[PDB]
C-alpha cells in the first residue's frame, strides 16, 4: 500500500487527520465534549443564556 | 511527468522527518540538556543544577572564524592574463554579485551551519522587483539556507539534486506558514499554512537543473550526503566532562568539609530540645565545649572529600579534548606556556590551519558551482568554458604575523634587483585581490613623481 | 441588518460589526440548542507546544 | 569469454562479500561502538556511557591533510619545454583536465578513503551529453570512487584489472539502484535497479585495458592488493585507551569520594523510619551529630579511589600512540614541549613528513597511470613515449617556515651575482608550477620599465 | 605575561577572531541602515553603487 500509494491515500490521510485534530480542539474548548482534565473550563459552561 | 501537489507532500515528509536526526547534533552547540551529561552521584532533587560544557561550541567557532574568500580566479581566455584587466574581467563580475548580496557576511553563517549539521544549501534566484526592494535588480539574488529550512534530494547515480523544498515556520516555530518547491525547469510557492493552502505562485526558469547547491561538510568519498563536524569522539568527551563537573559541584555542596560526630553523651545530658532534636551554639573563637562525657563518650569526624581528586580527571580530560579536536593547546587553557617566537606560533597552529584549508577546499567546490548557476541564469546559453576551471581564492587561515613577513618580503624584492617581481611580493604579504587592485592605482600615483 | 432592495449580504454575515463589536462566523459552533456566543473573548488564552 | 549479464551477478556477489571486511577499519575512523572498547569494571547498567578515542582519525587525517598535487613533469629531446600557458607543454594539457574535473577536491577526499580502507579507484570515461550537464564536453571525465562503491578483480600474474563493477545503493542504502560494468574494450550500465528495471546502455572504448586504476596503500611489495592505514598497533592502543577511559569515568560516578559508615547504634536508636531505612539529616555546614552510640559505637569511611592512578596510566597510552603513529608529540600530549624555532619544527615534523612523502610517491603512480590512460581515451592514437617517463610533483609536506626560507633564498640569489639562477630560487621558495607562469608575466611587465 | 609582540598575538588570537566575526555581522546592519538614511533625506532612489 505504501509503495503504491493508490489515490494518494497516504497524503490524503495526513490532511484528514490534521483536520480531525483541529476540530477536536474546538469541540473540547467550546462544548467540553471530550476535554482532557488539563483544560480549565469550556465556553459552553457559562451561567447565562 | 510528476505531479507538483503529490511532490510537495512527499518532500514535506522527507524534510520534516529528517529534522529528528539533526536535533541531536544541535544539542551540542546550543549546550541543550542531554540525559547522558548528568552526573550520577548528585542526589536526585539536586540533578536540576546542570553543568554545561563548551568543547563543541569552541571547535566549530575556531574553524568558522578563519574562513573567507579573497575572490575568484579564472583562466586566461586568450593571451597572457586577465589580471590587470580590472572591472571588465570575469573574476570581478563574480565578485560584484558576491559583494552586492553581502555573501561576505551570510556565507560565514552558511559555513558555520554546514559544520553544525553537516550540510547547508545555496539558492540562486533572479529577484522579483515586486518584493524585498533593498536589492540591485540587475544582480541574481543568492541566499544560503540551513537544513532546518531547506531540504534537497540528491540522485545517488549522478550527484545532482533531483528536486528540493524550502519551508518556513511561523514566529513561534509551531507551524509551517509557507513552502516552496524547486524543480529542474520551474519553482513554485504556496503562501499560507498547511491546513489553509492556496494556489501556487509559479515561475519557469531556463537552467535545466535545480537552482540549489548543497554545501556539504565531508571527509571521505564515502560521506555521500555530508557529516556533522562535531564527531562522536568529541561528543563523548563533552558529555564525560559534564558528568565530572556535576559530581564535583555536588561534592562541593555536600562533602568538601568534614562532618563532626559525638558518641556516648546522652541527648538529655546535652540538653537537646526533645521536640526539635537540636541545640544552639554561639561558637565564636576560643569557646571550649565542656561535656559531662562518661560511658566512653568522645568526638570523631568523617574527613572532607578532596576536590583535587576530581580536578586530576578534568586536567586529563582537557588533554583528551585538545588532541581529539586538534585545537591549539592554549585554546583549552592546558599549555605549559605561551608561544615565545614568530614560528613557535606556527607550530601550535599547524594542526588546525591545515584543517581549515581543507574546509576551504571542499566548500570551494560549492561556490564554484553556485557562480556557474548564477551566470547561466543571468546570461542564458552556454557558460564560457573557462568558467569550468575557476578556483576560489581564500584568506591564509593562520594568524597574521606582519612584522615577520615584512623583513622576509623586502629581502626577496631588494628594491627591484631581487628574486621576485613586485606583485608576487604583494601576494606574499597577504594583501587580498580586491586590495591589490586599488594598490596598483596608488603605485601609479606615486610613480608619477618617483 | 440589510437595506434598499435587499440585494447585498446581511452585515454580520459579511463579518461586519454589530453595535461596534466585530462578528466571527463558523460552520461548527452550534451543538444542541446553543448556536453562538457573545462575550469578552480576551478572557481566552491558548498555547501549543512544539 | 563470459556473457556480461552473467558476469555482473558474479561481480556483485564478490562486491557484496567485500563490504563485511572493509567495515572493520571503518569502525575506527568513525568512533563506532566496538565491544573491545568497553571498560570491564563499570556495572552492566553504566556500560551505555561509551568512551570514544580519537587516535585513528587523528592519524589518518594528519597524513591526508598534507597531500596536494601541484602539476606534472614530462621530459623531451629538446632539453626543456617552454612554460607556455594551458596546452603547448603537454603537462599543461594534463593540468587543464585536472581542473575541468575538480580533481583538486576529489583527490583530497579520495586519498582519505584510500588510507582508511586501503584502496580507491580512479575511473576514466568520455562525458555523456544527455546527462553530464556541468562539464566541458571535450575533456575526459576522470573521477574517484571509494571501495564501498567500486570493486575490481586484479590478476595476480600481471597486476592488471581484469574487469570491475561500480554499484550504487539507493538513498536508504538497501537496493542497488544501478550497476556499471567495465570490460577491457567496453563500458556497460543498467540504470534503474539491478538490470531488473532497465536494459543496459553500452559504449566501446579505444583501449586494451579496463578504464579503472586502483589507488592502493601498499607498505611493501607483499601488500599485493593494498591494506588499511589504521594499523593493528593503532587499533590496539585505541581500544586499550577506550577501556581505561571508561573505568575512570565509572570511578568518578561511584567512588571519587569516601563512603561514610557508623557501627554500634541500631536503626531504631537513630530514629530511622522503618519503611524507608533513612532519616533526613540536617545537612547544613558546621552541625555536630550527637548519638547515644549505646553499644560502644564508632565511625569509619571507605577511601575514595585516587583518580591519578588511572591518569598516569593514560599518559603511557598517549605516549605509545605517539611513537606508533609517528605524529609530532604536540599532536597528542599538551605536556610535550612546543618547539621554539624553525629548526626544532623540522625536527618534530620529520617523522611524519617522510611518511607523507611515501604516500605521495606511492599514490603518484596511480594518478600518473590514470593520465596516460586518459590520453589514449581522448586522442585515440598511441601515447608519445615521453609520457612513460612522466612524474608527479607535490606540495612540500612540511610547515611553510617562510621567514627562514626567504633569508636563505635571498643569500643564494644575491641580486643575480649569487649561486643560483632565478628559477631555482622560485622552486626553493615552494611556488607551484601554476604560479610560476604568473611569475613569468609579472617579471616581464617589470623588466619593461627596469 | 606574554613577553613579546608575537606572544601578544598568540594570547589575543581567539578574542581577535571573535571580534572580527562580530564586526562583519554588525557591519551588515549599518551597511543597510545608511541606505535608508540616504533614501529618506536625499529622496529619489538609491544610486546603484
TrEMBL record, chains B, D:
Lineage, opening ranks: Viruses, Duplodnaviria, Heunggongvirae, Uroviricota, Caudoviricetes
Alphabetical list of Pfam families matching this protein: SPP1_portal
Name of the protein this chain belongs to: Portal protein
Domain of life: Viruses
Organism per entry: Mycobacterium phage Bxb1
UniProtKB/TrEMBL annotation, chain C:
Signal sequence segment: none
Source organism superkingdom: Viruses
Record localization: Virion
Name under which the protein is recorded: Major capsid protein
Species name: Mycobacterium phage Bxb1
Complete-protein stretch covered: 200 to 249 of 397
Amino acid at each position: 500500500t505504501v509503495r503504491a500509494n493508490p489515490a494518494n491515500y497516504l497524503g490524503t490521510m495526513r490532511t484528514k487527520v490534521a483536520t480531525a485534530i483541529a476540530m477536536a480542539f474546538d469541540n473540547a474548548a467550546l462544548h467540553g465534549t471530550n476535554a482532557p482534565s488539563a483544560f480549565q473550563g469550556y465556553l459552553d459552561q457559562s451561567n447565562k443564556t | 511527468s510528476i505531479d507538483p501537489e503529490k511532490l510537495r507532500d512527499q518532500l514535506l515528509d522527507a524534510f520534516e522527518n529528517k529534522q529528528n536526526e539533526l536535533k541531536s547534533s544541535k544539542a551540542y552547540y546550543d549546550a541543550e540538556r542531554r540525559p547522558d551529561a548528568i552526573g550520577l552521584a548528585v542526589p536526585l532533587d539536586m540533578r536540576k543544577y546542570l553543568a554545561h560544557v563548551g568543547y563543541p561550541r569552541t571547535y566549530v567557532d575556531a574553524i568558522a572564524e578563519r574562513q573567507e574568500l579573497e575572490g575568484f580566479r579564472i583562466p586566461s581566455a586568450n593571451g597572457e592574463e586577465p589580471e590587470s584587466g580590472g572591472e571588465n574581467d570575469p573574476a570581478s563580475e563574480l565578485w560584484d554579485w558576491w559583494q552586492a548580496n553581502n555573501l561576505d557576511i551570510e556565507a560565514t553563517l552558511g559555513h558555520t551551519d554546514a559544520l553544525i549539521y553537516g550540510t547547508a544549501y545555496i539558492t540562486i534566484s533572479m529577484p522579483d522587483p515586486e518584493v524585498d526592494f533593498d536589492v540591485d535588480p540587475e544582480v541574481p539574488l543568492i541566499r544560503v539556507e540551513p537544513p532546518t529550512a531547506l531540504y534537497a534530494e540528491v540522485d545517488p547515480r549522478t550527484r545532482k539534486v533531483l528536486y528540493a523544498i524550502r519551508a518556513i515556520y511561523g514566529a513561534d516555530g509551531n507551524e509551517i506558514v509557507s513552502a516552496t518547491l524547486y524543480l529542474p525547469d520551474t519553482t513554485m510557492t504556496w503562501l499560507r499554512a498547511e491546513g489553509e493552502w492556496e494556489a501556487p505562485t509559479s515561475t519557469p526558469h531556463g537552467l535545466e537543473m535545480v537552482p540549489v547547491i548543497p554545501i556539504s561538510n565531508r571527509t571521505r568519498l564515502s560521506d555521500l550526503y555530508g557529516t556533522s563536524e562535531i564527531s562522536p569522539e568529541l561528543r563523548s568527551v563533552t558529555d564525560a566532562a559534564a558528568q565530572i563537573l556535576m559530581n564535583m559541584q555536588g561534592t562541593a555542596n555536600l562533602m568538601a568539609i568534614p562532618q563532626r560526630l559525638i558518641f556516648g553523651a546522652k541527648p538529655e545530658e546535652l540538653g537537646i530540645n526533645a521536640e526539635t532534636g537540636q541545640r544552639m551554639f554561639d561558637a565564636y573563637m576560643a569557646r571550649i565545649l565542656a561535656f559531662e562525657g562518661g560511658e566512653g563518650a568522645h568526638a570523631e569526624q568523617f574527613s572532607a572529600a578532596e576536590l583535587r581528586n576530581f580536578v586530576d580527571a578534568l586536567d586529563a580530560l582537557d588533554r583528551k579534548a585538545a588532541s581529539y579536536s586538534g585545537l591549539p593547546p592554549q585554546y583549552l587553557s592546558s599549555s605549559s606556556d605561551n608561544p615565545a617566537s614568530a614560528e613557535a606560533i606556527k607550530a601550535a597552529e599547524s594542526r588546525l590551519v591545515k584543517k581549515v584549508e581543507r574546509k576551504n577546499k571542499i566548500f570551494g567546490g560549492a561556490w564554484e558551482q553556485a557562480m556557474r548557476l548564477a551566470y547561466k541564469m543571468v546570461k542564458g546559453g552556454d557558460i564560457p568554458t573557462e568558467y569550468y576551471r575557476m578556483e576560489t581564492v581564500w584568506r591564509d587561515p593562520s594568524t597574521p604575523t606582519y612584522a615577520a613577513k615584512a623583513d622576509a618580503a623586502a629581502k626577496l624584492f631588494a628594491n627591484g634587483a631581487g628574486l621576485i617581481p613586485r606583485e608576487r611580493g604583494w601576494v606574499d604579504m597577504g594583501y587580498t585581490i580586491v586590495e591589490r587592485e586599488q594598490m596598483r592605482q596608488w603605485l601609479e600615483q606615486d610613480q608619477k613623481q618617483g | 441588518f440589510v437595506e434598499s432592495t435587499y440585494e447585498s449580504l446581511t452585515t454580520p454575515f459579511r463579518e461586519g460589526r454589530i453595535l461596534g463589536r466585530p462578528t466571527i462566523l463558523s460552520d461548527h459552533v452550534a451543538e444542541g440548542d446553543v448556536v453562538g456566543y457573545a462575550g469578552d473573548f480576551s478572557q481566552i488564552i491558548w498555547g501549543q507546544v512544539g
